[PDB]
Design a protein around this ligand. Structure first.
Ligand code: IJQ
Ligand code: MG
Ligand code: ZN
Length: 313
């Protein structure tokens, strides 16, 4: 009960900033996550013993893929931490509990392949879940792990509180399906601009939590340029493996996934920042003004990709 996690001074200060990088020491990521649950939620939110056992089971069910890995899970949870800490009073006790857990779990048992590749391969998961195929699987893996003995971190919640938190985690994880992001942000755009946006409306909260999930999920584009650039290498390492697998099924992959079209990555990054990232963090900043450093950092990284195209790097 009187047992705080404390980080070295550089980490203690920099973990509070949106652009923090969790570093290359895998063995510190669990302690980093617990530190964030404790400051974000409280030292009473979870039984330390159960939490530690849940974290280590989650780690074990992430795979050794270049991008959709345990580092990604903790990085996405850290961006959520920064959002929650900069918007103290906007979120319920259950939302604060549920969202860091959702983020840690949001890519559980990812194989480094997109929903499309599962559908073209005719993977069993694509018959069990016709849309948001991997995201429904990630939620399913979350429920599995919560049900392992000694793993129920929510054990002290009431029956209805428990159902509300699993329902926050489900929607939060489903929303990380980027196919859903576009419509979600358009609706939020209109509600904000016509002044209809209402955070006491549960369906409105749901959309706002969804946009936060997209924002945390994409947070590599809000880091310092060397983090952003090296993370994009991991992203394409997965995409190009998927492209190779498409070619094995006899299908020309989209260029994004075709390693033969490496040269076009910089232009593809501009498309991505303009079509996805910038609009995401813009709408987020409109709804939650203290998230502005994500928009500012994203703009800086867009300008770095523009310099890449101009041959200035
Ligand atoms: C940086 N970041 N963070 C998450 C993700 C991500 O998409 N996902 C899904 C798993 C994570 C990314 C990311 O880089 N995506 C690739 C962006 C992208 N690359 C290309 C492209 C085209 C041709 C040749 C080479 C590259 N086009 N394109 C694009 C263009 C317009 C609209 C959408 N995408
Ligand atoms: Mg995902
Ligand atoms: Zn993700």
């Amino acid at each position: 009960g009187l047992m705080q996690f404390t980080l070295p001074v550089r980490l203690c200060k920099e973990i509070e900033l949106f652009h923090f990088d969790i570093g290359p020491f895998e063995n510190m990521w669990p302690g980093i996550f617990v530190y964030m649950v404790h400051r974000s939620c409280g030292t009473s939110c979870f039984e330390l013993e159960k939490l530690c056992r849940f974290i280590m089971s989650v780690k074990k069910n992430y795979r050794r893929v270049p991008y959709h890995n345990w580092k990604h899970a903790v990085t996405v949870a850290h961006c959520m931490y920064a959002i929650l800490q900069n918007n103290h009073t906007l979120f319920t006790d259950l939302e604060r509990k549920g969202l860091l857990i959702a983020c840690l779990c949001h890519d559980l048992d990812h194989r480094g392949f997109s929903n499309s590749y599962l559908q073209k391969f005719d993977h069993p998961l694509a018959a069990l879940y016709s849309t948001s195929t991997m995201e429904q699987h990630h939620f399913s893996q979350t429920v599995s792990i919560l049900q392992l003995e000694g793993h129920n971190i929510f054990s002290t919640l009431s029956s209805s509180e428990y159902e509300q938190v699993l329902e926050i985690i489900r929607k939060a994880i489903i929303a990380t399906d980027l196919a859903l992001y576009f419509g979600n942000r358009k609706q939020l755009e209109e509600m904000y601009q016509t002044g209809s946006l209402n955070l006491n409306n549960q369906s409105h909260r749901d959309r706002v939590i969804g946009l936060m999930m997209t924002a945390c999920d994409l947070c590599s584009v809000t880091k310092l340029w060397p983090v952003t650039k090296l993370t994009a290498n991991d992203i394409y390492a997965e995409f190009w493996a998927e492209g190779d697998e498409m070619k094995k099924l006899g299908i020309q992959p989209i260029p994004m996934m075709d390693r033969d079209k490496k040269d076009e990555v910089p232009q593809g990054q501009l498309g991505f920042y303009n079509a996805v990232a910038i609009p995401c963090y813009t709408t987020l900043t409109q709804i939650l003004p203290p998230t502005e450093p994500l928009l500012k950092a994203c703009r800086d990284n867009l300008s770095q990709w523009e310099k890449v195209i101009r041959g200035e790097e």
